[PDB]
Amino acid sequence: VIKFRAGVCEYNEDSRLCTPIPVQGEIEIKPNEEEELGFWDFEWRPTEKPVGRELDPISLILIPGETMWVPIKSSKSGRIFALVFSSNERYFFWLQEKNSGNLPLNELSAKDKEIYNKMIGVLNNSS
Amino acid sequence: EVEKVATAVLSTTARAKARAKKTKKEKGPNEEEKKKEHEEKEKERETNKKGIKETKENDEEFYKNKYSSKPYKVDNMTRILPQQSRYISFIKDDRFVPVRKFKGNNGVVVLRDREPKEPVALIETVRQMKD
């Protein structure tokens, strides 16, 4: 199980604005093993900061071929953790992890290699 | 420990001397006739090496200048005794040039960077490492 500090972030189909509504919480990834698709559960939890749209916890399953990873999405903010579902289960997270700070930074985190490896492992692969 | 065993070897050879003057005449040929140890020069022997652990500083010869007048390069982030600080001048060859004049004293000094868009390594504070 891989945890890092993350916030909730808004999703849009309008123009794909994708700027964080900042909070503070975590994402906690269970890699799972259930069937051939893996179904890795991304459970988001708030721990402080009700300000904005808090988003009560919801676990989101990884369905492969509908979800997608791109580190930016409109180059307003980097670190766009993407679970694409086209307004079904679509809720976004924005890593807020400490690697040079919790800041927005383009092409994900400052520890560049570290975090690309995680994305391929969780998102693209199926257990 | 080193001196104990260096003194050991040397003293034994000295004692043997008086017998040795006449021995040494027979010894020369018997090496050519029979065999030699691993060298064919003389007979040369062991000497032993002594233990010296400390590399001491001498003292100055010039007290009139203890700071010469010649150039020397002094790196940023180093021990800076107040005598040096007077002759520190920031060089233009670098991007980095002082905002005002330099005080001639040690301290936190802020510089104007003409090209901050070019990669230079930077030195992380303690606080940075922990993030």
Using alpha carbons, select from A30, A4, A32 the residue that is nearest to residue A93: A4
In the stretch 31-90 of chain B, residues with CB closer than 8 A to chain A read: none
* Torsional sign, CA A53, A58, A64, A69: positive
What's this structure's resolution in Å? 5.4
In the stretch 101-130 of chain B, residues with CB closer than 8 A to chain A read: none
Please state the three-class secondary structure of chain A as a single string: CEEEEEEEECCCCCCCCCCECCCEEEEEEECCCCCCCCCCEEEEEEEECCCCCCCCCEEECCCCCCCCCCCCCCCCCCCEECCCCCCCCCCEEEECCCCCCCCCCCCCCCCHHHHHHHHHHHHHCCC
Contact residues of A toward B, CB < 8 A = 98-101
The alpha carbon of residue A110 is apart from the nearest alpha carbon of chain B, in Å, by 11
- Decide if A49 contacts A4 (C-beta within 8 A): no
Judged by a CB distance cut-off of 8 A, whether residue B131 touches chain A is yes
The DSSP bridge pattern shows strands B96-98 and B111-113 to be: antiparallel
Experimental method for this entry?
Answer: cryo-EM
Nearest chain B residue to A98, by CA: B131
Residues of A in contact with B131 (CB under 8 A): 98-101
Number of residues that this document lists for chain B: 131
For chains A and B, CB pairs below 8 A equal 4
User: CB count, 10 Å around CB of B83?
Assistant: 9
Residues of B in contact with A99 (CB under 8 A): 131
C-beta pairs of B80-88 under 8 Å, 24+ apart in sequence: B80/B106, B82/B106
- Decide if B120 contacts B114 (C-beta within 8 A): no
The alpha carbon of residue A39 is apart from the nearest alpha carbon of chain B, in Å, by 32
The alpha carbon of residue A15 is apart from the nearest alpha carbon of chain B, in Å, by 32
Please state the three-class secondary structure of chain B as a single string: CHHHHHHHHHHHHHHCHHHHHHHHHHHHHHHHHCCCCCCCCCCCCCCCCCCCCCCCCCCCCCCCCCCCCCCCCCCCCCCCCHHHHCCCCCCCCCCEEECCCCCCCCCCCCEEECCCCCCCCCCCCHHHHHC
Nearest chain A residue to B124, by CA: A100
User: CB count, 10 Å around CB of A46?
Assistant: 16
A63, exposed or middle or buried, with CB in 10 Å at 0-12, 13-18, 19+? middle
The alpha carbon of residue A123 is apart from the nearest alpha carbon of chain B, in Å, by 26
Residues of B in contact with A100 (CB under 8 A): 131
Nearest chain B residue to A102, by CA: B131
